[PDB]
Amino acid sequence: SDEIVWQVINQSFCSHRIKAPNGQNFCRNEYNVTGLCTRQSCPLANSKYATVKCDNGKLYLYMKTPERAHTPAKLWERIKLSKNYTKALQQIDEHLLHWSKFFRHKCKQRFTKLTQVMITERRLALREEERHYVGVAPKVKRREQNRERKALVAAKIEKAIEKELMDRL
Amino acid sequence: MRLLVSCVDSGSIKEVLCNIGTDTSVQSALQPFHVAPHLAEGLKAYVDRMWVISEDEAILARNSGVVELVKISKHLKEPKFDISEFEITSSVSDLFDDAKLESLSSKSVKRTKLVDGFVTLCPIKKSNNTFVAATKSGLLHIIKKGEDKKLIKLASLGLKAPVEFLQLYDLEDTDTDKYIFAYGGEENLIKLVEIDSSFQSLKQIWEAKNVKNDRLDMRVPVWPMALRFLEPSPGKTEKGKLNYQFAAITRWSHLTKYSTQHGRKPFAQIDLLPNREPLSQMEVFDAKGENVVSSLGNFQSETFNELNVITTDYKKNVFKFDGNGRMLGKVGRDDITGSSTYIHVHDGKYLLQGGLDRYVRIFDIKTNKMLVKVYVGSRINFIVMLDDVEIE
Amino acid sequence: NPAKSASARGSYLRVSFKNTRETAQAINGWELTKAQKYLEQVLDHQRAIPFRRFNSSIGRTAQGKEFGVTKARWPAKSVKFVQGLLQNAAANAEAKGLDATKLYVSHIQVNQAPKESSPSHIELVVTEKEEAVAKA
Amino acid sequence: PHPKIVKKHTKKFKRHHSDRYHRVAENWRKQKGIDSVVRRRFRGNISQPKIGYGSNKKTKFLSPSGHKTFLVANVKDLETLTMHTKTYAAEIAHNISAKNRVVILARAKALGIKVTNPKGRLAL
Amino acid sequence: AKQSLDVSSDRRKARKAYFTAPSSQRRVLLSAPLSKELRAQYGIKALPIRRDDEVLVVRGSKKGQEGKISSVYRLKFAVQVDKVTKEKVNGASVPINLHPSKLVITKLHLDKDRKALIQRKGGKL
RNA sequence: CGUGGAGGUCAGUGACGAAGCCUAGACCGUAAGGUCGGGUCGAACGGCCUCUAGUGCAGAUCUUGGUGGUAGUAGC
RNA sequence: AUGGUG
RNA sequence: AUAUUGGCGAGAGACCGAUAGCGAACAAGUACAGUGAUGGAAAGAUGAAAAGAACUUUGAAAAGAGAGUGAAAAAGUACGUGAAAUUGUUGAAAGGGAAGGGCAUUUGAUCAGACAUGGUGUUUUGUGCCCUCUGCUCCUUGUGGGUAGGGGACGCAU
């Protein structure tokens, strides 16, 4: 039962966990709220869980329960969510009903964030056509510098000037 | 060979004469016989498009807004070969309107002003003197050349401007008399217009509508660049709907495969390239060098999967794709240095090439080797293959 | 400035590091042919060459009054090698097309070599001093 | 925001006699010599490390600009920061190529995360 | 996988045995692929290279150049194809070595042992 | 905390430059240490969970190598 | 101490 | 059945990776020393390929310069990487009786120093995942997904 699956995840390793330089350690699972694998956010030890996730469409609320626990290929249920931030939030705290406060409180947030993200990405889609990033490989550098140096060296550069001036005379 | 190439610098038409295998990049390879300017009228008058029904008769579309007419004849040279002389028999002038365009130059994303020019010149029908000449500005000058030896203006007609491309659907037959164009352009969905031999009457029989909003719940842009028809679709022919199939290229790299019987949306719009790579023109080739096409280029067969196309960017690249979009591969990859302005599949077994690079190039479809390369020293927008010739 | 310059190099000489060192240092900045003049005048026991560094067992000598020092010496071996360096540097210079009237020694260097002798590696870049270096 | 960030001691500790010798390095090590001056803490000598310098659990590990630091490699990794853009800022482990950095960049502005070390390997 | 107890997987061995291998064995380690038209033509895949025949170059900076082998150099595990040529600046022309795996064989040089060879593996001709 | 190798795991990173070395650059650790920015370089390498050691240097008239002062000295 | 070269 | 550091072949390693491991990865019981028994070293790496630098030049010279080859001589048989000690040059800075460290500022130099460029509304106007018709599909059959066509005016753009 689940608390064991936790404690196994809290001593042995998850395939996914991060341990940032400060003491706290993320959880890189695709499906979770908050992205920190701790007792109440780690999707692998809950058995009852709900998050929000983008499809590339709008934001499907994914839900699971104990009953499909053994049937992973289809475990997560899924719902879409409206384009009304207001109506969305009402849908979210709708489906979640007596799901404990954690998931309403947080799921709502993940919605807010991903929506904002969308909006930004929409702005940035419209901006600054100019000055893309570019890398330059190292040997590109070395090559350019040297070949240039030799370029100048080859041109004694005054002989051209004077000879052009004797020309003009 | 004997070819013609439009020289944008002097506004002339060069003729090129040489064998398969030519290159000017080295003194070793075999050399061109002849290159000639002709009838160079200046940067304004450079040739926008060119058509030759039969070897002596070639019609000029001239960016001054002037259609001319060209009589061709061989004569002694100066081994052995012949060249020709190019002089204009007929003309009809001032066919453009700039100001209507200039009023919309603000909405487009392109450069500064928008010149009026010929986006189509061709015969109708495939045995006929008729010519449908298109302008940027929407003005359709339909002009049959009278047997008087002279060109005569049949009509000027309107379009929903500007008009980037226009196509005539000949795949059925010469007979049925009622002609379909498809045209499109800036933020301008693809439109099917029809015209009677009364040549005063155009009703718009069909119009596409754009695909649904994209991943970001934003709106995909609308810019159809080029359109090539197929046969009507086999199967049960359906209520109230025209039966046609056609496929179109957008600036935004979308390949767009339209089947009317399905409806107004495209049933496949597939980006060929990463992140909105701008494309241009089009060619429909076939794998084996085979000739699958009409004389104005519409591919002949009723299933897309059998389609293969050549499309260019604005930089160097020239690509070969299937109906699905899976890239067959680049052409001239290691060679082309510049914007490739013009490409025309010839005989299904050849590839015309030329552009800003100033090398006219000729590649082979199946081998994918460069056959011919000539340095005209000019930007060249257009190429026509005249007689393939013997060399004496 | 490399565009107007000439380089002579020498390496794997067998000399004394210290003597070659100083006798290199003495001419830094001098005009070309006045330099040759010097090395000539100093090889024949006229005007010896001051040693500011290694002064043990160096007899007080008058002519050093030019440089601010009572100590100097007439080293044989050194001014030979650096002499030649000035020769070939003049060759490199002329075939370059430089101007011997502007030509002076902009850089001179010696530094040690493997091994028990004290071989040397010498570097000199002469260049033609130009009137009017930089506005601004 | 955050409290005001106070280091308690901002100068790196050096090993006794580090500079008078090269055969000795600059990484702090203790003095076990029971006679030594640095061990018995005579006036005027260097300052040992000792626990009291330990910083403030609130702002500990905070980079100055106020975020923390979290060290990412590919984009799939920074997606863990969709939640915390207000606490963690993420930077790009050194060996990343110049090919993928630009990807982490674009996507990292869309999310609105602060990348401490952009401009690494990227020109314009 | 390695089932047979008596083969060995050691890297260091197989390196040694590769660099000590005698010219007999350096014959067959040079097997080069026949081109496709030959793959069907003589009904086979790749056959040890000899001196006189004609070959085409697929990989390497030499792409598309082809010729008939001048000599074949079994000490340096190479083959010197004709008219694939460096020129030291004095005009002398040194053959670029081409390791054979990267070659494809256009024209054979058919000898009676090339006949019986092509026959032993099952090629029809 | 760090070093050498191992069993997992990051579908980790890497010729668009892995290691390594320089650094009058930055940040993090109280510290052991860590992590990034430039620079040189060319082919492997790292983080988390655990195992195992030939695992951490200022010294030993320490060993081996390289260098100096002694000094162009006593001297030949 | 054993066994050896002078 | 057991023994086995020698021989003659094999297969392997949580072994060592050039001061390690055999003493010896290389022309090692080699050069060497001893009268003789005997004692016994150091020393691996260009590159993809020698294309190991034509040719002109100073110089008898050892070397140098111009010029090329190579992706890189910033890889030239002193050759991958190139550390420290220690030395030369150029510049800084102080010094004349000392250097070094600790707490603190000063002055000089010097470096870093956002693709921040929005948010909340309010209106005008197109489009569509909105409205209204008409379907189709998969299954955890539920307060669900997926998808098409004809039209019309909640998210998006303006």
PDB file of N, CA and C in Angstrom, chain C residues 10 14 39 78 94 99 101 110 112 119 128 134:
ATOM      1  N   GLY C  10      66.861  33.839 -33.578  1.00  0.00           N
ATOM      2  CA  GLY C  10      67.975  32.924 -33.455  1.00  0.00           C
ATOM      3  C   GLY C  10      67.644  32.028 -32.296  1.00  0.00           C
ATOM      4  N   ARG C  14      74.942  28.609 -28.595  1.00  0.00           N
ATOM      5  CA  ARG C  14      75.699  28.252 -27.401  1.00  0.00           C
ATOM      6  C   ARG C  14      76.491  29.477 -26.987  1.00  0.00           C
ATOM      7  N   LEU C  39      78.218  47.971 -31.725  1.00  0.00           N
ATOM      8  CA  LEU C  39      78.760  46.636 -31.541  1.00  0.00           C
ATOM      9  C   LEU C  39      80.159  46.522 -32.123  1.00  0.00           C
ATOM     10  N   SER C  78      79.520  37.137 -27.567  1.00  0.00           N
ATOM     11  CA  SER C  78      78.133  37.582 -27.628  1.00  0.00           C
ATOM     12  C   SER C  78      77.882  38.466 -28.837  1.00  0.00           C
ATOM     13  N   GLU C  94      65.439  44.546 -45.798  1.00  0.00           N
ATOM     14  CA  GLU C  94      65.537  45.145 -47.121  1.00  0.00           C
ATOM     15  C   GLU C  94      64.640  44.424 -48.115  1.00  0.00           C
ATOM     16  N   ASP C  99      62.580  50.741 -44.815  1.00  0.00           N
ATOM     17  CA  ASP C  99      63.389  51.943 -44.958  1.00  0.00           C
ATOM     18  C   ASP C  99      64.464  51.955 -43.879  1.00  0.00           C
ATOM     19  N   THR C 101      66.514  54.090 -43.022  1.00  0.00           N
ATOM     20  CA  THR C 101      66.731  55.330 -42.292  1.00  0.00           C
ATOM     21  C   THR C 101      65.768  55.483 -41.130  1.00  0.00           C
ATOM     22  N   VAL C 110      66.254  37.721 -24.998  1.00  0.00           N
ATOM     23  CA  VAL C 110      66.961  36.448 -24.953  1.00  0.00           C
ATOM     24  C   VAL C 110      66.444  35.677 -23.764  1.00  0.00           C
ATOM     25  N   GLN C 112      66.402  31.399 -21.895  1.00  0.00           N
ATOM     26  CA  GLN C 112      67.323  30.286 -21.795  1.00  0.00           C
ATOM     27  C   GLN C 112      66.887  29.150 -22.696  1.00  0.00           C
ATOM     28  N   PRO C 119      72.842  27.732 -23.166  1.00  0.00           N
ATOM     29  CA  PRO C 119      72.494  28.184 -24.513  1.00  0.00           C
ATOM     30  C   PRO C 119      71.367  29.200 -24.496  1.00  0.00           C
ATOM     31  N   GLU C 128      60.691  50.285 -38.574  1.00  0.00           N
ATOM     32  CA  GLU C 128      61.018  51.597 -39.109  1.00  0.00           C
ATOM     33  C   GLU C 128      60.146  52.611 -38.378  1.00  0.00           C
ATOM     34  N   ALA C 134      50.006  58.889 -34.443  1.00  0.00           N
ATOM     35  CA  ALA C 134      48.564  58.853 -34.268  1.00  0.00           C
ATOM     36  C   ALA C 134      48.037  60.254 -34.062  1.00  0.00           C
TER      37      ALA C 134
END
